[PDB]
């Protein structure tokens, strides 16, 4: 957690930015995982992962440049998950 991969400056401007946004995105992902676990999951390196069944589907990631973290469940029903995204 010591400014992961960008603790030292003087490498590149973008480095500190990506470091900060990645740390904060992981923080928000862990926060989401917290409420998910309190209801009744795991995570990964880029973003979090949440299952829907008990066997693959329902992957959710984060926008490294802005809010409104996107998500895409392999399958059908387009232009409808966008409402979930907004919510």
């Amino acid at each position: 957690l010591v400014e992961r991969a960008m603790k030292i400056d003087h490498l590149s401007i973008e480095k500190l930015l990506i470091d900060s946004v990645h740390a904060r995105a992981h923080q928000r992902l862990q926060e989401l995982k917290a409420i998910l676990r309190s209801f009744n999951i795991e995570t990964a390196l880029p973003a979090l992962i949440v299952p829907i069944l008990e066997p693959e589907c329902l992957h959710i990631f984060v926008d490294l440049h802005s809010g409104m973290f996107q998500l895409m469940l392999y399958g059908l029903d387009p232009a409808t998950l966008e409402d979930m995204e907004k919510s």
């Binding site: 590149s12 990506i18 880029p46």
Partner: protein, 100 residues
């Protein structure tokens, strides 16, 4: 200088740095022993590297692009992306001029 375009579909990679992009042996390429104007070779190489600069500048415009159904991280010279959790991305480029 000189440039090189290369794509690698590996497994995955974190935000780390190692012996990745082309080393001191920058872009091994044809010696071009057949007789041709050397100045013209330098000129076409410059045209090529400017084309690489332009295509990379265009490709960089992806963070402000449509961020839907394809989340992806992007930094200088690295555009590593995960369309499916099987393949890899981040076509790269180098400058084969800093080697006496």
């Amino acid at each position: 200088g000189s440039a090189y375009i290369k794509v690698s579909i590996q497994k995955q990679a974190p935000d780390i740095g190692d012996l990745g992009t082309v080393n001191l042996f920058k872009r091994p390429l044809p010696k071009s022993k057949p007789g041709s104007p050397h100045w013209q070779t330098k000129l076409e190489a410059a045209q090529n590297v400017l084309l690489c600069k332009e295509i990379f500048a265009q490709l960089s415009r992806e963070a402000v692009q449509i961020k839907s159904q394809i989340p992806h991280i992007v930094v200088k010279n690295q555009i590593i992306s995960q369309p499916f959790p099987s393949l890899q991305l981040s076509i790269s480029l180098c400058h084969s001029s800093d080697d006496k």
